[PDB]
């Protein structure tokens, strides 16, 4: 009496849908033999073996470390220095960045043109970068030609000279460089955050320095700065790839001389005038901008503080989300799940910055001006739930992720040498892989709760926002959202 199941349009489509759902039903065990979605803690002792890190201090007090591996055809050499933008006087602020830009153009024995043609002819190149507490000059070169690179490095570090017309053209290009740092606003937000969370202390200042100061930066400042802060004990010479420790130490003992021997260590410059975290906010309102950016941050741990490992585990378990990621709404952490399901942001990225004697720990989201309060609510809810009721699968997953990230980042010779230099400046020694793992898997739910109570629970905050932020909750809202009255 009724039509057959094929006579009408909707019946056929319904049958097709049920056919697909049928062909989704039964799985195959042989494709489900080795993997599980439940995190577990596993030991990696039999793969963590790696070559040695020969460190040889010298009678002048200049440490030298190498990670020798004699199968490669390239090597990298550099000079990490324990000086940076923290150690200026607010009347010569950007002197470090200026000195970095200028050290590449003197060297009376070989003029600038000679420098770049020489480095280009062999096929290698060298870089340089600075920060608030470190400065780097490293040369990536071919294995056959390490001694030439070492000679270049020694000469540019020691016998540099500075000229007035050189000064003028460099100050013009640096004024330009300042003029194009304002178009990305992530570094603008972070400069404002660092200059309000650390007001009236050396960490407040910016790396570039005021344009009121870049104009009056003549050679006297450069010479005094290089003779004061570039001393023998505050330098480390590193090298990875295909090198030999004994040759390198030979010509290091031969070429590296004439260094100023000053009795001034970084620790005894940081001991007086330390970093003090206050807690404030800066709200920049423009309203002609389509998107709003803001960051909220507590205080943190030091380099040698034992709790920095737990802080990094926490940052891993408060992960990052982005609108073009493959996770979506299935991304493990609860904060990323809330942001992804409710579509209340463009991107968020928890951060963790360490220093000697202080640190920071925050979130930094970006979103439309009509979802700001929901975003802030979710952010603070998860930030406090860490201190209240941290689970166990979360902690195992976060420990796994931290292990994988830390090891997978080490790849090549530049990362290896950068690791060696940075760690020899911060910890005074290079942490092996085994000790780092044994420290990482020693953080449990109880330790997460304890450290969160120490750092997160009912402490002050620092906020920095920019754009159309007329719907962002005030400071008292954020301050009061650091505890729960139900417990």
């Amino acid at each position: 009496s009724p039509p057959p199941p094929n006579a009408m349009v909707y019946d056929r489509l319904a049958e097709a849908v049920k056919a697909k759902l049928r062909q989704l039903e039964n799985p195959d065990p042989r494709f489900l033999k080795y993997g599980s979605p439940r995190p577990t803690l596993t030991d990696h002792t039999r793969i963590l073996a790696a070559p040695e890190t020969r460190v040889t201090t010298l009678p002048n007090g200049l440490r030298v470390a190498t990670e020798s591996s004699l199968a490669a055809r390239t090597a990298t050499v550099g000079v990490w220095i324990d000086a940076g933008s923290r150690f200026e006087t607010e009347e010569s602020n950007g002197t470090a960045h200026f000195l970095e830009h200028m050290i590449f153009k003197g060297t009376e024995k070989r003029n600038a043109r000679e420098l770049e043609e020489e480095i280009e002819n062999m096929g290698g190149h060298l870089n340089a970068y600075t920060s608030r507490e470190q400065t780097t000059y490293y040369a990536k070169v071919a294995d056959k030609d390490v001694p030439k690179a070492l000679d270049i490095l020694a000469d540019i570090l020691q016998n540099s000279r500075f000229d007035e017309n050189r000064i003028s053209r460099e100050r013009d290009v640096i004024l330009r460089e300042m003029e194009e740092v304002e178009g990305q606003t992530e570094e603008v937000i972070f400069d404002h955050l660092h200059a309000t969370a650390f007001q009236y202390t050396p960490l407040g200042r910016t790396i570039l320095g005021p344009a009121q100061n870049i104009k009056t930066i003549t050679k006297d400042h450069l010479q005094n700065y290089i003779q004061t802060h570039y001393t023998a004990p505050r330098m480390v010479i590193a090298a990875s790839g295909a090198v030999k420790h004994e040759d390198i130490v030979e010509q290091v003992k031969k070429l590296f001389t004439k260094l100023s021997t000053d009795p001034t260590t970084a620790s005894q410059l940081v001991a007086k005038e330390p970093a003090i975290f206050t807690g404030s906010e800066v709200r920049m309102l423009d309203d002609e901008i389509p998107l709003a950016q803001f960051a909220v941050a507590f205080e943190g741990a030091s380099w040698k503080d034992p709790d920095s490992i737990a802080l990094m585990v926490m940052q891993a378990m408060l992960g990052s989300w982005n609108k073009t990621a493959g996770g979506g709404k299935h991304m493990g952490s609860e904060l990323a799940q809330r942001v992804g399901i409710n579509e209340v942001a463009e991107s968020m990225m928890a951060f963790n910055t360490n220093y000697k004697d202080t640190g920071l720990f925050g979130v930094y989201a970006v979103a439309k001006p009509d979802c700001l309060d929901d975003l802030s609510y979710a952010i603070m809810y998860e930030t406090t739930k860490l201190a209240y009721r941290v689970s166990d699968d979360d902690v195992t997953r976060a420990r796994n992720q931290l292990k994988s990230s830390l090891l997978l980042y080490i790849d090549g010779t530049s990362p290896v040498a950068e690791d060696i230099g940075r760690q020899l400046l911060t910890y005074g020694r290079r942490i092996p892989f085994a000790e780092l793992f044994a420290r990482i898997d020693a953080v449990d739910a109880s330790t997460i709760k304890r450290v969160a109570n120490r750092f997160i629970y009912d402490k002050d905050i620092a906020i920095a926002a920019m754009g159309p932020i007329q719907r962002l909750p005030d400071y008292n809202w954020f301050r009061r959202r650091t505890y729960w009255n139900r417990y």
Binding site: Y388, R389, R486, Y487
Partner: peptide, 29 residues
């Protein structure tokens, strides 16, 4: 997850009982 919740429930019960013995002050009980 259970222990923290149940401990908080017990302490809230203690608070409720203390409030009750504040509103009423019976020495016969």
């Amino acid at each position: 997850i259970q222990p923290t919740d149940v401990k908080a429930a017990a302490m809230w019960g203690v608070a409720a009982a203390t409030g009750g013995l504040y509103l009423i002050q019976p020495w016969g009980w």
